[PDB]
Amino acid sequence: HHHHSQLENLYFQGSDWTSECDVLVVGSGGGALTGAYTAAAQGLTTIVLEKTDRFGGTSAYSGASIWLPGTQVQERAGLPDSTENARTYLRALLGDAESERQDAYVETAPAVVALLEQNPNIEFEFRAFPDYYKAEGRMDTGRSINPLDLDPADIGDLAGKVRPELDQDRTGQDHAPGPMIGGRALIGRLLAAVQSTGKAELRTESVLTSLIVEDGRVVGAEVESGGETQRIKANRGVLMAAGGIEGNAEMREQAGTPGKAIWSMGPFGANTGDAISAGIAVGGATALLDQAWFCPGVEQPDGSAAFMVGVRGGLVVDSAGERYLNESLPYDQFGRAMDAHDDNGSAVPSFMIFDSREGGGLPAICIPNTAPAKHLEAGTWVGADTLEELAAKTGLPADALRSTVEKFNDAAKLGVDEEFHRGEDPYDAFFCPPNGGANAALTAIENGPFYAARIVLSDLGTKGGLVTDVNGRVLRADGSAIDGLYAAGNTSASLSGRFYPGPGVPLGTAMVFSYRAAQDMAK
Ligand SMILES: Cc1cc2nc3c(=O)[nH]c(=O)nc-3n(C[C@H](O)[C@H](O)[C@H](O)COP(=O)(O)OP(=O)(O)OC[C@H]3O[C@@H](n4cnc5c(N)ncnc54)[C@H](O)[C@@H]3O)c2cc1C
Ligand SMILES: CC(=O)OCC(=O)[C@@]1(O)[C@H](C)C[C@@H]2[C@@H]3CCC4=CC(=O)CC[C@]4(C)[C@@]34O[C@H]4C[C@@]21C
């Protein structure tokens, strides 16, 4: 499959519609299902198309922190926050560029949440996770909401259809004993809500192939399910929330997107730009394709990565064995700083230096979390009883590494990182449990043996794609809208530009613009 557009007159030379619906939704992420619910709940027949054999995609893998501020959820917690406070934070970071979509995101949040919580399968709650930048309107505790843990039993036959967490999915496993949490809860509840409307069809192994145009309006889509080809009519429109280009190496090389497909934490084979491609075909503009939701990734034996989040020890060096960033930085800034510092391989990979403080464990949350033994067997990590020998085994300058570590250890005993101010932020301190020092983020690495872990530039999906308006309408280069086509999530170029403002902005933008697209289609 390439994603070439059909004219209906052309297809009318032999074929005819194999199905029909008011709202066709391509994908089954947070956005897709939120747009599907918005449409089905108010009477529009909806068909949801999931390419793989599991609903949720990267949204299922997520922790389902959602940046929808100023809502009834934050009020129940008595949060010192408001729609206007949130608007200020976004303006202070992104500027006036895309200010209309900024306004729409922050202004629509409450309505999205009111509608979804109204369903008996959906309820959210505030959970503390700090916003990620020092700027007016920042929330040091955060303002993001999560779905409640869900007993799989409460959604029947939909639980087995939800994509399992990364610690199970990249190892041929299903959901474990632990109840549906984070992204698994988000998708389980939204599938249940969407089903409960009695106006929606949920399909797996149904792949978008081409949009169908008639007189320059999108009227439906070519789909591939069970060997054969289907032509699905869409009376009001098609919503494309099938993710980004994260799994398509060629589209990334072309755009100049840093990182690699094999490093992305998107489900292997799922998000390959199918929708973005299909949208360009029918005349859609694109932006920001070189941009991603970046994160450090712990390189794996199989050459893929694990999301490294909530760092609470060690330090990181370039190929010169010298710290170049605040290891406790939020993951998108961490990653962008690796990219900036890279002189043809000096920083990608970087090397995370740690000791036996965590009995051989890397002092951070790795998702998924491979056993140290497997890393050491494979040579992604390296271990030694001395820094001299560790530098030998890793090809790091031994004089430099040893200076870097003596200097870091000095700052740990002092309590301040003169070079990179590590631990001096509410995010940095959020993951650090108090030790016996003056700074919980700085812990001396003098306990043997010492380990070196290769860190690459991973991602949580791309954020470049089709240009959209405040209603998720796909636009041509001239600014005109392509009637019948709407895009959201990572299929749509982020209003957030080169910024990850705080936890849940991906799912948050996805859910608001998916919702707004349905509202537009309701007309
Ligand atoms: C471990 C982890 C934690 C994260 N935590 C959070 C968090 O807490 N909060 C947050 O906001 N973000 C978080 N993120 C990021 C977030 O998961 C993604 O950026 C977001 O879910 C992207 O949603 P999407 O709709 O763009 O993609 P997805 O959720 O992946 O949805 C895309 C779906 O479309 C399907 N699809 C693709 N092509 C086609 C086609 N042609 N036809 C039909 N279907 C197709 C795919 O199979 C997939 O099922 C996290 C990421 C990871 C890896
Ligand atoms: C799972 C459990 O029992 O507790 C462990 C945890 O806290 C998690 O693993 C949860 C699965 C969600 C949580 C957070 C939620 C907020 C968030 C939103 C984003 O968009 C990016 C990802 C983060 C920063 C998140 O770090 C991931 C993963 C952790 C740390």
CSV table of N, CA and C in Angstrom, one decimal, residues 381-447:
chain,number,residue,atom,x,y,z
A,381,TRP,N,25.0,-2.4,28.1
A,381,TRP,CA,25.6,-2.0,29.3
A,381,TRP,C,27.0,-2.7,29.5
A,382,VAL,N,27.8,-2.1,30.3
A,382,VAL,CA,29.2,-2.5,30.6
A,382,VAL,C,29.5,-2.4,32.1
A,383,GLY,N,30.2,-3.3,32.8
A,383,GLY,CA,30.4,-3.2,34.2
A,383,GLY,C,31.9,-3.4,34.6
A,384,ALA,N,32.4,-2.7,35.6
A,384,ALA,CA,33.8,-2.8,36.0
A,384,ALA,C,33.9,-2.5,37.5
A,385,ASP,N,35.0,-3.0,38.2
A,385,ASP,CA,35.2,-2.7,39.6
A,385,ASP,C,35.9,-1.4,39.8
A,386,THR,N,36.3,-0.7,38.7
A,386,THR,CA,36.9,0.7,38.7
A,386,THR,C,36.5,1.5,37.5
A,387,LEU,N,36.5,2.8,37.7
A,387,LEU,CA,36.2,3.7,36.6
A,387,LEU,C,37.2,3.6,35.5
A,388,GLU,N,38.5,3.4,35.8
A,388,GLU,CA,39.6,3.2,34.8
A,388,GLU,C,39.2,2.1,33.8
A,389,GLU,N,38.8,1.0,34.3
A,389,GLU,CA,38.5,-0.2,33.6
A,389,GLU,C,37.2,0.0,32.8
A,390,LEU,N,36.2,0.7,33.5
A,390,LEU,CA,34.9,1.0,32.9
A,390,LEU,C,35.1,1.8,31.6
A,391,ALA,N,36.0,2.8,31.7
A,391,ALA,CA,36.4,3.7,30.6
A,391,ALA,C,37.1,2.8,29.5
A,392,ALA,N,37.9,1.9,29.8
A,392,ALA,CA,38.6,0.9,28.9
A,392,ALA,C,37.4,0.2,28.1
A,393,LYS,N,36.6,-0.5,28.9
A,393,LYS,CA,35.5,-1.3,28.2
A,393,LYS,C,34.6,-0.5,27.4
A,394,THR,N,34.4,0.8,27.6
A,394,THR,CA,33.4,1.6,26.9
A,394,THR,C,34.0,2.5,25.9
A,395,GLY,N,35.3,2.5,25.7
A,395,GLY,CA,36.0,3.5,24.8
A,395,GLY,C,35.8,4.9,25.2
A,396,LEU,N,35.8,5.2,26.5
A,396,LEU,CA,35.6,6.6,27.0
A,396,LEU,C,37.0,7.0,27.5
A,397,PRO,N,37.4,8.3,27.3
A,397,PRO,CA,38.6,8.8,27.8
A,397,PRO,C,38.6,8.6,29.4
A,398,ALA,N,39.6,7.9,29.9
A,398,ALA,CA,39.7,7.4,31.3
A,398,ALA,C,40.0,8.6,32.2
A,399,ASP,N,40.9,9.5,31.8
A,399,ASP,CA,41.2,10.7,32.6
A,399,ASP,C,40.0,11.5,32.8
A,400,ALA,N,39.2,11.8,31.7
A,400,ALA,CA,38.0,12.7,31.7
A,400,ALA,C,36.9,12.1,32.5
A,401,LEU,N,36.5,10.8,32.3
A,401,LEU,CA,35.4,10.1,33.0
A,401,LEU,C,35.7,10.3,34.5
A,402,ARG,N,36.9,9.9,35.0
A,402,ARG,CA,37.3,9.9,36.4
A,402,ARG,C,37.2,11.4,36.9
A,403,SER,N,37.6,12.4,36.1
A,403,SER,CA,37.5,13.9,36.6
A,403,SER,C,36.0,14.1,36.7
A,404,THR,N,35.2,13.9,35.6
A,404,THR,CA,33.7,14.1,35.6
A,404,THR,C,33.1,13.5,36.8
A,405,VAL,N,33.5,12.3,37.2
A,405,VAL,CA,32.8,11.6,38.4
A,405,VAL,C,33.3,12.2,39.7
A,406,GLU,N,34.6,12.4,39.9
A,406,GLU,CA,35.1,13.1,41.2
A,406,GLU,C,34.4,14.5,41.3
A,407,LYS,N,34.2,15.2,40.2
A,407,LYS,CA,33.6,16.6,40.2
A,407,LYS,C,32.1,16.5,40.6
A,408,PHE,N,31.3,15.5,40.0
A,408,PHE,CA,29.9,15.3,40.3
A,408,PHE,C,29.7,14.9,41.7
A,409,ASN,N,30.6,14.0,42.2
A,409,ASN,CA,30.6,13.5,43.6
A,409,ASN,C,30.8,14.6,44.6
A,410,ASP,N,31.6,15.6,44.2
A,410,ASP,CA,31.9,16.7,45.0
A,410,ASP,C,30.6,17.6,45.2
A,411,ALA,N,29.9,17.7,44.1
A,411,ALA,CA,28.6,18.5,44.1
A,411,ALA,C,27.6,17.8,44.9
A,412,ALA,N,27.6,16.5,44.9
A,412,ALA,CA,26.6,15.7,45.6
A,412,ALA,C,26.8,16.0,47.1
A,413,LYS,N,28.0,15.9,47.6
A,413,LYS,CA,28.3,16.2,49.0
A,413,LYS,C,28.0,17.6,49.3
A,414,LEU,N,28.3,18.5,48.4
A,414,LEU,CA,28.0,20.0,48.6
A,414,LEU,C,26.5,20.2,48.6
A,415,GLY,N,25.8,19.8,47.6
A,415,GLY,CA,24.3,19.9,47.5
A,415,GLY,C,23.9,20.8,46.3
A,416,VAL,N,24.8,21.2,45.5
A,416,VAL,CA,24.4,22.0,44.3
A,416,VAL,C,25.3,21.5,43.1
A,417,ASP,N,24.7,21.4,41.9
A,417,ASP,CA,25.4,21.1,40.7
A,417,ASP,C,25.7,22.4,40.0
A,418,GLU,N,26.9,23.0,40.2
A,418,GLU,CA,27.3,24.3,39.7
A,418,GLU,C,27.1,24.3,38.1
A,419,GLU,N,27.6,23.2,37.5
A,419,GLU,CA,27.6,23.1,36.0
A,419,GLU,C,26.2,23.1,35.4
A,420,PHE,N,25.3,22.2,35.9
A,420,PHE,CA,23.9,22.1,35.3
A,420,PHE,C,22.7,22.3,36.2
A,421,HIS,N,23.0,22.7,37.4
A,421,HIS,CA,21.8,23.0,38.4
A,421,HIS,C,20.9,21.8,38.5
A,422,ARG,N,21.4,20.6,38.6
A,422,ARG,CA,20.5,19.4,38.7
A,422,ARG,C,19.9,19.4,40.1
A,423,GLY,N,18.6,19.1,40.2
A,423,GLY,CA,17.8,18.9,41.4
A,423,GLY,C,17.2,20.2,41.9
A,424,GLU,N,17.5,21.3,41.2
A,424,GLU,CA,17.0,22.7,41.5
A,424,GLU,C,15.7,23.0,40.8
A,425,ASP,N,14.8,22.0,40.6
A,425,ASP,CA,13.5,22.3,39.9
A,425,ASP,C,12.5,21.3,40.5
A,426,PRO,N,11.2,21.6,40.5
A,426,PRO,CA,10.2,20.8,41.1
A,426,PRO,C,10.0,19.4,40.3
A,427,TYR,N,10.3,19.4,39.0
A,427,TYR,CA,10.3,18.2,38.2
A,427,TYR,C,11.5,17.3,38.7
A,428,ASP,N,12.7,17.8,38.7
A,428,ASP,CA,13.9,17.0,39.1
A,428,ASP,C,13.7,16.4,40.4
A,429,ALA,N,13.2,17.2,41.4
A,429,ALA,CA,13.0,16.7,42.8
A,429,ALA,C,11.8,15.7,42.9
A,430,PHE,N,10.9,15.8,42.0
A,430,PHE,CA,9.6,15.0,42.0
A,430,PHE,C,9.9,13.5,42.1
A,431,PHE,N,11.0,13.0,41.4
A,431,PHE,CA,11.2,11.5,41.4
A,431,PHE,C,12.3,11.1,42.4
A,432,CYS,N,12.9,12.1,43.1
A,432,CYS,CA,14.0,11.8,44.0
A,432,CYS,C,13.6,11.6,45.4
A,433,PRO,N,13.6,10.4,46.0
A,433,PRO,CA,13.3,10.2,47.4
A,433,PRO,C,14.5,10.7,48.2
A,434,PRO,N,14.2,11.5,49.3
A,434,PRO,CA,15.3,12.1,50.1
A,434,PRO,C,16.4,11.0,50.5
A,435,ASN,N,17.6,11.4,50.3
A,435,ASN,CA,18.8,10.6,50.8
A,435,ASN,C,19.4,11.2,52.0
A,436,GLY,N,20.6,11.0,52.3
A,436,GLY,CA,21.3,11.6,53.5
A,436,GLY,C,22.1,12.8,53.1
A,437,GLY,N,21.7,13.4,51.9
A,437,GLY,CA,22.5,14.6,51.4
A,437,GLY,C,21.7,15.9,51.4
A,438,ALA,N,22.2,17.0,50.9
A,438,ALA,CA,21.6,18.3,50.9
A,438,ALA,C,20.7,18.4,49.6
A,439,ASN,N,21.0,17.5,48.6
A,439,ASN,CA,20.2,17.5,47.4
A,439,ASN,C,19.9,16.0,47.1
A,440,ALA,N,18.6,15.7,46.9
A,440,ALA,CA,18.2,14.3,46.7
A,440,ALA,C,18.4,13.9,45.2
A,441,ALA,N,18.6,14.8,44.3
A,441,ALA,CA,18.8,14.5,42.9
A,441,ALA,C,20.3,14.2,42.7
A,442,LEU,N,21.2,14.7,43.6
A,442,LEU,CA,22.6,14.4,43.4
A,442,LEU,C,23.0,13.3,44.5
A,443,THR,N,23.4,12.1,44.0
A,443,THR,CA,23.9,11.0,44.8
A,443,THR,C,25.2,10.6,44.3
A,444,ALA,N,26.2,10.6,45.2
A,444,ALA,CA,27.6,10.2,44.8
A,444,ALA,C,27.7,8.8,44.2
A,445,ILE,N,28.4,8.6,43.1
A,445,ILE,CA,28.6,7.3,42.4
A,445,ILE,C,30.0,6.8,42.7
A,446,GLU,N,30.2,6.3,43.9
A,446,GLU,CA,31.6,5.8,44.3
A,446,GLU,C,31.4,4.3,44.8
A,447,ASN,N,30.2,3.8,44.7
A,447,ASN,CA,29.9,2.4,45.1
A,447,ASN,C,30.2,1.4,44.0
